[PDB]
């Protein structure tokens, strides 16, 4: 339709939450481990178990980082979102 | 303690898929028929309208990685990723 769809506003929300947290410390367009932790704990508190160990956040960033610079840009973040969402789908029809 | 915008975003991706994948044939996958309407009805501000069969052939081809002629949810999330990334650069 002519209105922004639910899908299109969902996409915008993915963009907004990223900039909401990447803009906090250091590079405003990437998430340092500091910023990643806050995002997950405040905005994903129903899908993923809370992170309280530094060891946990270390291992996750390593797995998310495919270009190997130790931080999560938006492109890498979409992969993460894709990954998390798929898992939730599987756990609704099983 | 109340579901985030992010968490409601992820759910919405699931809902829009099922809204369209449940229509014809496999209710858990999108045939080209269903994919076209989804794009045309729900992505009419991000993607150019599809009216050519040639277009839908090509989109499904790029989207279909398991070679079944349909778009399952996993393949669809990749699509969302692709579109979303593009929208970021122009913002």
């Amino acid at each position: 339709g002519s209105h922004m769809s639910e899908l299109e506003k969902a996409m915008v929300a993915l963009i907004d939450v990223f900039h909401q947290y990447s803009g906090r410390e250091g590079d405003k367009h990437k998430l340092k481990k500091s910023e990643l932790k806050e995002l997950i704990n405040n905005e994903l508190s129903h899908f993923l178990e809370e992170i309280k160990e530094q060891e946990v956040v270390d291992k996750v960033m390593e797995t998310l980082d495919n270009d190997g610079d130790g931080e999560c840009d938006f492109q890498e973040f979409m992969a993460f979102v894709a990954m998390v969402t798929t898992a939730c789908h599987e756990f609704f029809e099983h | 303690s109340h579901m985030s915008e992010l968490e409601k975003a992820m759910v919405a991706l699931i809902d829009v898929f099922h809204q369209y994948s449940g229509r014809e044939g496999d209710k858990h996958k999108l045939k080209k028929s269903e994919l076209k309407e989804l794009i045309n009805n729900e992505l009419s501000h991000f993607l150019e309208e599809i009216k050519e069969q040639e277009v839908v052939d090509k989109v499904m081809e790029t989207l279909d990685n398991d070679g079944d002629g349909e778009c399952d949810f996993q393949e669809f999330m990749a699509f969302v990723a692709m579109v979303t990334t593009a929208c970021h650069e122009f913002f």
């Binding site: 797995t63 495919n66 492109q75 992969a79 894709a82 990954m83 798929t86 | 501000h45 991000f46 993607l47 150019e48 277009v55 090509k58 989109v59 790029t62 996993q74 990749a78 990723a81 692709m82 579109v83 990334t85 593009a86 929208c87």
Partner: peptide, 19 residues
């Protein structure tokens, strides 16, 4: 406004997915 399979195909190779 607006994208196309132009730009869509343009971001299929910059990243596959470490799914």
């Amino acid at each position: 406004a607006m994208a196309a399979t132009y730009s869509a195909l343009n971001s299929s190779k910059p990243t596959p997915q470490l799914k």
